[PDB]
């Protein structure tokens, strides 16, 4: 039986990795729809190669351009435009799975639409669980959607957990399945071996120099502060329904091990592999089976040494903020994430120091939280939080 | 409900670790029988603490001694003696699981008896699969016994494999479940960083210094040559039904990782933990659930650095011999194991050099293999033949 897919966010690197897996398994997967933002040139090339039934641009003007370009290159592809069209392709009857890889706030509504339709969700959008975890888990339970996490760490944890837990995300009783705790791993960022005193002076040039990867500058800074891990922590809490006793963070500088699980008998399972997103994506497509992903086997002769260390809160005050916000709930995580988007832009623009990012997040978080949720209500909250963060940034210069 | 257990080999370290697990879970496991060889002093203390229904010594004279002690220390325990009594406790109707931890050739018959009775076998005897793999897998299939491997590496592999493979040991189709390679790990022994050239001059004193554990001198020398890993390789081939392409050996000097599995999509699963046999034993008792084992969580503060290297067959010629013998079949693995027991005794009596151990194994193996359906008895005869041939080659080497 062929798996039919909608890919939301087809022109970015997650979309490319998904398409590489599908290309390696032409008998097993079939693309019905491709959707993107306003990169028409990339989209026309993908529609030419894939000849999908539907192609959607989130931007209506971009959709008009694509429709002109496709009318002969991809003549059986119907081009659509706008937010309602993203929901439409995410909810088609013939579709089994939706790669939810549109990033930011814009991804929430279509990701939610696929959830309400009971699809298999290949979740590659952080905001769904960072802003609105409770709401998504509640809707997933209502519709019978399956949630399969795409992010490297979550996907690793998922593989290290037993099958009964894998098939019950959002709701799982970890203790009763013999899990003592999940070990969420991270690189520690470029300042992992730098003195706390030196952090005041660090520049964006220094903070973006990620030790293992070359990502967007926003996410690279989140890795320098470990806000990135804090957001992964929040997501993991909702995916695996972890109490405050059941989720830990460890620094693993080399990022070969992607995360681990500690079982009750003393046994630890760990997931490792080459740093290629096709591996985890492949699992989310194929679960409970496995398929070729175009990724080579890990070469242990070249892996080097693996080490571990303990983060501290002097160095990574953002990680404390995120864990705290995590157990305060959606209002708090929404606020923190919004504050941090603004604080990080402010550091990239040289308006504030590196150590002010956490100060901004701390102020905004305190104000909002001192003084029924919906996607709309949480977006309003995001706006409010952004305004407060704008105000604190002004003061810090 | 309650799992009822017979423990074959209760007085060694595997038996102690099993009993530590059972002690942590008094509502889940129950000891019906304890069996041992001729360590009466330890047995009588264990029977005093556990008050089992049966206590068996393999040696009949030892069983008489135990009966007299238990007249005072465990008056409701029935003591029995001899090989037939081991089979008797291994096949009791009320028993669900049998810890098969009697070592050597002596363990084969009782282990086989529990297999024929359809029990859950917690397999901690290397000879069952090293000497007679085919025969055990065939009997397990016929009776409906479950085989759960106790040894650290095999247990780790088991935990890193998918559930459909876990429930089909002996007969599994690895390729179809997405498994590319099983990665059997080992410390490399005390000569892992020593030049090939210097191995001629090695002393028993040097070879018994295993860098992570402290053990019997035979097994310590098997780690120095990696014959120990070779034997684990052979066992793994029968447990997981693995071709030579599907089974690789990696040296991992720190032995925190206990083995790994490489999947088709690029994903690797690894099992790690504190070095305590209670962990794997616990899983063999509790599968598919998990129980407390009296083992702490792994402390990543104390792990140090984890490294990996490819073994050099120039350095570990016994490992190459074992992998070769593995795909030649029961005759070749039986022969190798016998030759190696003799060669190692010869090195531990200073009759031969460390590098001769492999030369002895190589000669015997070649001689035997240039030449009804196999049986435990037939394979034991072959073991004897092999021992005689190895005796001769030892005489020839100095």
Which residues from chain A sit within 8 angstroms of residue B307, using beta carbons? 304-306
Q: Where are the beta strands (DSSP E) in A49-171?
A: 54-57, 78-81, 97-100, 120-123, 146-149
Question: What stretch of H or E contains A323?
Answer: helix A317-328
Which residues from chain B sit within 8 angstroms of residue A308, using beta carbons? 300-301, 303
Residue with tokens 């992903």: A293
Which residues from chain B sit within 8 angstroms of residue A268, using beta carbons? 271-273, 297-298
Question: Resolution limit in angstroms?
Answer: 2.3
Distance, CA of B91 to CA of B100 (rounded, Å)? 12
Distance, CA of B369 to CA of B361 (rounded, Å)? 12
Determine if residue A126 is labeled as part of a ligand binding site: yes
- What are the residues whose beta carbons fall under 8 Å from the beta carbon of B44, sequence distance 6 or more? B66, B69, B70, B73, B74
CA B99 centroid distance within chain: 12
DSSP, collapsed to helix, strand or coil, labels residue B8 as strand
DSSP, collapsed to helix, strand or coil, labels residue B375 as coil
Cβ-contact B113, B29 below 8 angstroms: no
Q: Quick one: which of A60, A151, A145 has its CA closest to A101?
A: A151
Which residues from chain A sit within 8 angstroms of residue B263, using beta carbons? 290
Which residues from chain B sit within 8 angstroms of residue A279, using beta carbons? 265-267
In chain B, the largest separation of any two C-alpha atoms, in whole Å, equals: 62
A340-345, Cβ contacts within 8 angstroms, sequence gap of 24 or more:
A340/A222, A340/A227, A341/A218, A341/A386, A341/A389, A342/A386, A342/A389, A342/A390, A342/A393, A343/A389, A343/A393, A344/A218, A344/A221, A344/A222, A345/A218
* Minimum-distance CB partner of B297 among A180, A298, A306: A180
Separation in Å, CA A162 to CA B160, B241, B279: 11, 23, 17
- What are the residues whose beta carbons fall under 8 Å from the beta carbon of A168, sequence distance 6 or more? none
DSSP, collapsed to helix, strand or coil, labels residue A42 as helix
Cβ-contact A102, A58 below 8 angstroms: yes
Distance, CA of B191 to CA of A34 (rounded, Å)? 57
User: Rounded to a whole number, what is the distance in angstroms from the first to the last CA of chain B?
Assistant: 61
> What is the Rg, in whole angstroms, of the alpha carbon atoms belonging to chain B?
21
CA A297 centroid distance within chain: 25
Distance, CA of A14 to CA of A150 (rounded, Å)? 9
Tokens linked to B33: 């029988």
| Contact flag A270-B267 (C-beta cutoff 8 Å) | no
User: How many CB atoms within 10 Å of residue A244?
Assistant: 9
Provide the chain B residues 162-221 that lie in CB contact (below 8 A) with chain A.
Answer: 162-163, 177-178, 180-181, 183
Q: Quick one: which of A172, A159, A325, A163 has its CA closest to A246?
A: A172
User: How many CB atoms within 10 Å of residue A15?
Assistant: 23
Distance, CA of B238 to CA of B222 (rounded, Å)? 20
- What are the residues whose beta carbons fall under 8 Å from the beta carbon of B195, sequence distance 6 or more? none
Pick one of 1.10.10.10, 3.30.470.20, 1.10.3430.10, 1.10.1740.10 as the CATH number of A313-397: 1.10.1740.10
Which residues from chain B sit within 8 angstroms of residue A274, using beta carbons? 266
CATH topology for the B313-398 domain = Rna Polymerase Sigma Factor; Chain: A (1.10.1740)
Interchain contact B289–A (C-beta under 8 A): yes
Separation in Å, CA B326 to CA A295, B105, B132, B231, B241: 30, 19, 11, 9, 12
User: How many CB atoms within 10 Å of residue A39?
Assistant: 17
Interchain contact A290–B (C-beta under 8 A): yes
* Ranges of each domain in chain B: 1-151, 152-312, 313-398
Tokens linked to A221: 């800074």
Strands B179-186 and B257-263: antiparallel
Strands B247-251 and B257-263: unpaired
Which CATH class for the A1-151 domain?
A: alpha beta
Distance, CA of A345 to CA of A338 (rounded, Å)? 11
Cβ-contact B147, B121 below 8 angstroms: yes
Is there a shared CATH topology between the B1-151 domain and the B313-398 domain?
no
CA B272 centroid distance within chain: 19
Helix ranges restricted to H, B287-351? 317-328, 330-347
Distance, CA of B102 to CA of B87 (rounded, Å)? 12
Q: Which of A248, A265, A279, A308 to mutate against chain B (most B CBs within 10 Å)?
A: A265
Residue with tokens 């030449």: B371
DSSP, collapsed to helix, strand or coil, labels residue B148 as strand
Cβ-contact A265, B291 below 8 angstroms: yes
Method used experimentally: X-ray
Query: What is the DSSP annotation of B187-246?
Result: ---TTTTS-GGGGGG--HHHHT--SS----HHHHHHHHHTHHHHHHHHHHHHHHT--GGG
B119-122, Cβ contacts within 8 angstroms, sequence gap of 24 or more:
B119/B90, B119/B91, B119/B95, B119/B145, B119/B146, B120/B96, B120/B145, B120/B146, B120/B148, B121/B97, B121/B145, B121/B146, B121/B147, B121/B148, B122/B18, B122/B97, B122/B98, B122/B148, B122/B150, B122/B281, B122/B284, B122/B285
Cβ-contact A280, A160 below 8 angstroms: no
Distance, CA of A338 to CA of A331 (rounded, Å)? 11
| Contact flag A307-B309 (C-beta cutoff 8 Å) | no
Cis peptide before B288 (omega within 30 of 0): yes
Q: Between A and B, how many residue pairs show a Cβ–Cβ distance under 8 A? A: 142
B298 to chain A, closest Cα gap in Å? 7
Cβ-contact A332, A325 below 8 angstroms: yes
DSSP, collapsed to helix, strand or coil, labels residue B301 as coil
Distance, CA of B3 to CA of B296 (rounded, Å)? 24
In chain A, the largest separation of any two C-alpha atoms, in whole Å, equals: 62
Residue with tokens 């070990």: A183
Distance, CA of A314 to CA of A2 (rounded, Å)? 52
Q: Quick one: which of B270, B243, B121 has its CA closest to B173?
A: B243
Which residue in B has a C-alpha nearest to residue A310's C-alpha?
Answer: B301
- What are the residues whose beta carbons fall under 8 Å from the beta carbon of B177, sequence distance 6 or more? A289, A290, B161, B162, B164, B165
| Contact flag A271-B274 (C-beta cutoff 8 Å) | no
| Contact flag B301-A310 (C-beta cutoff 8 Å) | yes
Distance, CA of A311 to CA of A288 (rounded, Å)? 34
């Amino acid at each position: 039986g062929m798996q039919k897919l909608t890919i939301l966010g087809a022109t970015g690197s997650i979309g490319a990795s998904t398409l590489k897996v599908i290309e390696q398994n032409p008998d097993k997967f079939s693309v019905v729809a491709l959707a993107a933002d306003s990169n028409v040139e990339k989209m026309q090339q993908l529609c030419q190669r894939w000849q999908p039934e539907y192609a959607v641009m989130a931007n209506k003007e971009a959709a008009l351009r694509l429709k002109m370009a496709l009318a002969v290159l991809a003549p059986n592809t119907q081009v659509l435009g706008g937010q309602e069209a993203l929901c439409y392709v995410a909810t088609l009857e013939q579709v089994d799975s939706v790669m939810a890889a549109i990033v930011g706030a814009a991804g929430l509504v279509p990701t939610m639409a696929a959830v309400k339709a009971g699809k298999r969700i290949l979740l590659a959008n952080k905001e769904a669980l960072v802003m609105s975890g409770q709401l998504f888990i509640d809707e997933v339970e209502k519709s019978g959607a399956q949630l399969l996490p795409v992010d490297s760490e979550h996907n690793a944890i998922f593989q290290c957990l037993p099958q009964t837990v894998q098939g019950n995300l959002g709701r799982c009783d970890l203790a009763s399945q013999g899990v003592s705790h999940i070990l969420l791993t991270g690189s520690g960022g470029p300042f992992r071996y730098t003195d706390v005193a030196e952090l005041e002076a660090v520049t964006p040039e220094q903070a973006i120099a990620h030790p293992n990867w070359s990502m967007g500058p926003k996410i690279s800074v989140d890795s320098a502060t470990m806000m990135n891990k804090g957001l992964e922590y929040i997501e993991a809490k909702w995916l695996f329904n972890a109490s405050r006793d059941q989720l830990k963070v460890i620094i693993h500088p080399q990022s070969v091990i992607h995360s681990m699980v500690q079982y009750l008998d003393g046994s630890v399972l760990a997931q490792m592999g080459e740093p290629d997103m096709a591996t985890p994506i492949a699992l989310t497509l194929s679960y409970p089976e496995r398929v070729k992903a175009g990724v080579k086997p890990l070469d242990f002769t070249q892996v080097g040494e693996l080490t571990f260390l303990q983060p501290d809160f002097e160095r990574y005050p953002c990680l404390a903020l995120a864990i705290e916000a995590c157990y305060l709930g959606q209002h708090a995580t929404t606020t923190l994430n919004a504050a941090n988007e603004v604080a990080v832009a402010a550091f990239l623009a040289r308006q504030i120091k590196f150590t002010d990012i956490a100060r901004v997040n701390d102020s905004v978080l305190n104000q909002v939280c001192k003084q029924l949720d919906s996607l709309e209500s949480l977006l309003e909250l995001d706006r409010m939080a952004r305004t407060l963060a704008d105000e604190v940034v002004r003061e810090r210069a």
